[PDB]
Design an enzyme around this catalytic site. Structure first.
Site, short mmCIF file in Angstrom:
data_model
loop_
_atom_site.label_atom_id
_atom_site.label_comp_id
_atom_site.label_asym_id
_atom_site.label_seq_id
_atom_site.Cartn_x
_atom_site.Cartn_y
_atom_site.Cartn_z
N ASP A 79 0.80 -1.22 0.00
CA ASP A 79 0.00 0.00 0.00
C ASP A 79 0.83 1.28 0.00
O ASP A 79 0.32 2.32 -0.41
CB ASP A 79 -0.94 0.03 1.21
CG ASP A 79 -2.03 -1.01 1.13
OD1 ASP A 79 -1.96 -1.88 0.23
OD2 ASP A 79 -2.97 -0.96 1.95
N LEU A 129 -4.67 1.43 -6.45
CA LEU A 129 -4.18 1.59 -7.80
C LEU A 129 -3.93 0.22 -8.40
O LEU A 129 -3.37 -0.67 -7.74
CB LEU A 129 -2.90 2.42 -7.83
CG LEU A 129 -2.86 3.61 -8.78
CD1 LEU A 129 -3.96 4.62 -8.46
CD2 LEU A 129 -1.50 4.26 -8.73
N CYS A 160 0.13 -8.67 6.26
CA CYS A 160 1.28 -9.01 5.44
C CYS A 160 1.11 -8.45 4.04
O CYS A 160 0.00 -8.39 3.50
CB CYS A 160 1.49 -10.52 5.36
SG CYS A 160 2.03 -11.29 6.89
N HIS A 214 -10.05 0.41 -1.65
CA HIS A 214 -8.99 0.04 -2.58
C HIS A 214 -9.53 -0.89 -3.66
O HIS A 214 -10.30 -1.81 -3.37
CB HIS A 214 -7.83 -0.63 -1.85
CG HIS A 214 -7.17 0.24 -0.82
ND1 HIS A 214 -6.17 -0.21 0.01
CD2 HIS A 214 -7.37 1.54 -0.49
CE1 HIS A 214 -5.78 0.77 0.80
NE2 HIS A 214 -6.49 1.84 0.52
N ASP A 271 -7.86 -3.07 -5.18
CA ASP A 271 -7.31 -4.41 -5.03
C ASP A 271 -8.11 -5.26 -4.05
O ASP A 271 -7.77 -6.43 -3.85
CB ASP A 271 -5.83 -4.33 -4.63
CG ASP A 271 -5.62 -3.94 -3.17
OD1 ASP A 271 -6.60 -3.65 -2.46
OD2 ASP A 271 -4.45 -3.94 -2.73
#
Ligand SMILES: N[C@H](C(=O)N1CCCC1)C1CCN(c2nccc3c(-c4ncc(Cl)cc4Cl)cccc23)CC1
Ligand SMILES: [Ca+2]
Ligand SMILES: [Ca+2]
Ligand SMILES: [Ca+2]
Ligand SMILES: [Ca+2]
Length: 650
Positions: free
Chosen positions: A345, A396, A630, A456, A458
């Site tokens: 991140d 992103l 993680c 996000h 992702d």
């Protein structure tokens, strides 16, 4: 011989001028004629071509002819040379003036010429060699047929002594630093000295002074030193002129990426200046210009071959380390470990490339420079301080190369999570979006991520390559896929299967308990609408059909702000190492000592030649509250397609 320059003969006196090859002179002989003079003749030396021009019609005149022409304002000379003067040169043009009376001249005006060659040369044809005076060297055009020299941002670090990247100062300490810079050669030919009153000056605008650095290597054949001659607080530099055929080699470094209000284009100039007098500015009688485009920062999609995997976690997260090591050993990649998700991140591996050089560049946006990163041929750019959770490299993504309505995006498109225009919701800060757009080559697209608590992209999407093909797949989180699977397992008599087995900190959650939760159903129906709204943008902006999309089961819980957080680990946010996928372990209901989410994901991906390894990144914490602690990041080979061969929209 193409640029016309006005050089007038002076009444009675003799005019001495430097002639720069590539130009020619138009010369007034009429104003210098004595009053009453009626005709003129002329002489000239061998290496000066002279034409008399009488109303646009030019006539080539011999060196020593006795021909006379009527004096007229519309009768002039055109004077051209093609070879530079030497020490044995006497390049001259002489005009004799006659009155109507006799054939003996009554006065004489002379032009004495010193021809020099001046040319500021760059590698505008992009082959890594500085050709001689590329005609398009003062412009920059996109495409395979385009031209214009390219410049890297010198943001790596050749020596560890100093803490910041090389371009932060106006010094060069290692000659290896020159390999990152673009070569610019001042090529000249002429006599031992410039005539009195001339000097050659390199200069840049004040605006470009924080965009480039220009260096010169002194004493290359012994102990080498590197002189900063243009850039920060140095706008011009008087060049020491060397006679004969001389080349001055300069090295140019970029200091600044394209951004809002900086297009990436920088200009360097060389001028021949004439000394007019004290208190008068020197006249630029000849100016040559070269342009550079600073190379943009490019992000690497998951379809690019992995080079090395960067992993951040705690020292006792043994299961995670072991399984990531096992995964990377199925591949040819290196593993680099650092002892929460900042490596995913806060950090992002991109690259820059010029025809002569390129290397990886990591952008860092803290919420200290990672030491296992900056160094030789590894760029590191940190954000300038002073945001919401949407300001994160987790928000992103970059797509594989795509073609959309005939328009090709050979480097993919950057995807940015955002909110709806009229929503009043969160949005990535304008500086970030403007910077990504300013790179141009990965035409960013805004998605809808503000329905997620963290926000996000992702969290709900990813791309994997299809092994053995040039095609890829879009992976989408799907709550409807999850309810379909759970209703199936419940129908099959597994409603009492427990979720999160192996996590002692977690509730007695079963399939039956999940399907009976009406509120949770409505929430995930809404979240499916949010996912489908993004699905429609991705298909439209990436040229995708339903055949290019796999829906992975996912489940969310709604918070007070009506935003979603993962109910179980988001499997879409996976490590993609070509055919090898490291998928967050879902900890779903176990059917026959096997996670039914794991078996389902395998059934979706494995038939395509994709190999699934499920990585446990939460067992060391004993429970899952929606957070991954993680991170991993993959440094990939750059695109083989050179960015400068693209043609971005205007
Ligand atoms: N002058 C600098 C420059 O070119 N050099 C400085 C050292 C040598 C070369 C520019 C670097 C880029 N700068 C940024 N502008 C927007 C964003 C940024 C981000 C980011 N942070 C979060 C996300 Cl999600 C996405 C991004 Cl790209 C990270 C890091 C820097 C950024 C603007 C200044
Ligand atoms: Ca070249
Ligand atoms: Ca430096
Ligand atoms: Ca460097
Ligand atoms: Ca370097």
């Amino acid at each position: 011989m193409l640029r016309e320059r006005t050089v007038r003969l002076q009444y009675g006196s003799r005019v001495e001028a430097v002639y720069v090859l590539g130009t020619y002179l138009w010369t007034d002989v009429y104003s210098a004629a004595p009053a009453g003079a009626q005709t003129f003749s002329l002489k000239h030396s061998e290496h000066v071509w002279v034409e008399v021009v009488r109303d646009g019609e030019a006539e080539e005149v011999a060196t020593n002819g006795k021909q006379r022409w009527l004096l007229s304002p519309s009768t002039t000379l055109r004077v051209t040379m093609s070879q530079a003067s030497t020490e044995a040169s006497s390049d001259k043009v002489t005009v004799n003036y006659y009155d109507e009376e006799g054939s003996i001249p009554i006065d004489q005006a002379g032009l004495f010429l010193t021809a020099i060659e001046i040319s500021l040369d760059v590698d505008a044809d992009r082959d890594g060699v500085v050709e001689k005076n590329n005609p398009k060297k003062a412009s920059w055009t996109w495409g395979p047929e385009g031209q214009g020299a390219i410049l890297l941002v010198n943001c790596d670090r050749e020596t560890p002594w100093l803490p910041k990247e090389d371009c932060r100062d106006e010094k060069v300490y290692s000659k290896e630093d020159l390999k990152d810079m673009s070569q610019m050669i001042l090529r000249t030919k002429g006599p031992d000295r410039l005539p009195a009153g001339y000097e050659i000056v390199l200069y840049i605008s004040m605006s470009d002074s924080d965009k480039v650095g220009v260096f010169y290597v002194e004493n290359p054949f012994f102990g080498q030193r590197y002189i900063h001659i243009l850039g920060r607080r140095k706008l011009y530099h008087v060049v020491k002129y060397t006679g004969g055929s001389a080349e001055l080699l300069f090295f140019v470094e970029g200091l600044c990426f394209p951004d809002e209000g900086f297009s990436g284009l920088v200009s360097i100039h060389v001028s021949l200046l004439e000394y007019m007098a004290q208190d008068i500015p020197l006249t630029p009688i000849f100016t040559d210009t070269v342009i550079f485009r600073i190379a943009p920062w490019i992000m690497t999609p998951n379809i690019l071959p992995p080079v090395s995997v960067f992993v951040c976690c705690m020292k006792d997260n043994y299961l995670f380390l072991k399984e990531v090591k096992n995964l990377v050993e199925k591949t040819n990649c290196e593993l680099k470990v650092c002892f929460d998700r900042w490596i995913q991140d806060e950090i992002e591996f991109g690259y820059i490339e010029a025809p002569h050089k390129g290397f990886p560049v990591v952008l860092d946006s803290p919420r200290f420079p990672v030491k296992e990163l900056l160094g030789p041929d590894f760029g590191y750019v940190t954000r300038e301080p002073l945001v919401t959770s949407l300001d994160s490299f987790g928000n992103l993504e970059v797509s594989p190369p795509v073609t959309v309505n005939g328009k090709t995006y050979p480097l993919g498109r950057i995807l940015i999570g955002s909110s709806f225009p009229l929503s009043g919701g969160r949005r990535m800060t304008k500086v970030v979006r403007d910077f990504l757009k300013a790179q141009q080559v990965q035409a960013p697209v805004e998605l809808y991520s503000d329905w997620l608590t963290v926000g996000h992209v992702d969290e709900f999407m990813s791309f994997v390559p299809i092994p053995g093909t040039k095609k890829f797949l879009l992976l989408m989180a799907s709550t409807s896929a999850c309810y379909k699977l759970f209703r199936e397992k419940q129908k099959d008599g597994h409603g009492e299967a427990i979720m999160f087995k192996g996590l002692g900190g977690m509730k007695r959650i079963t399939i039956n308990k999940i399907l009976s939760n009406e509120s949770l159903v409505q929430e995930n129906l809404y979240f499916q609408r949010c996912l489908d709204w993004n699905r429609d943008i991705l298909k439209k902006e990436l040229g995708l059909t339903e055949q290019d999309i796999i829906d992975l089961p996912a489940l969310f819980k709604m918070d007070e702000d009506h935003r979603a957080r993962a109910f179980f680990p988001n499997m879409v946010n996976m490590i993609v190492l070509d055919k090898d996928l490291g998928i967050p372990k879902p900890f779903g209901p176990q059917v026959e000592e096997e996670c039914c989410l794991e078996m389902h994901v395998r059934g979706l991906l494995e038939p395509l030649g994709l190999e699934c390894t499920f990585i446990d990144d939460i067992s060391a914490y004993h429970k899952f509250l929606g957070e991954v602690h993680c991170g991993t990041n993959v440094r990939r080979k750059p695109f083989t397609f050179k960015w400068w061969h693209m043609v971005p929209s205007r």
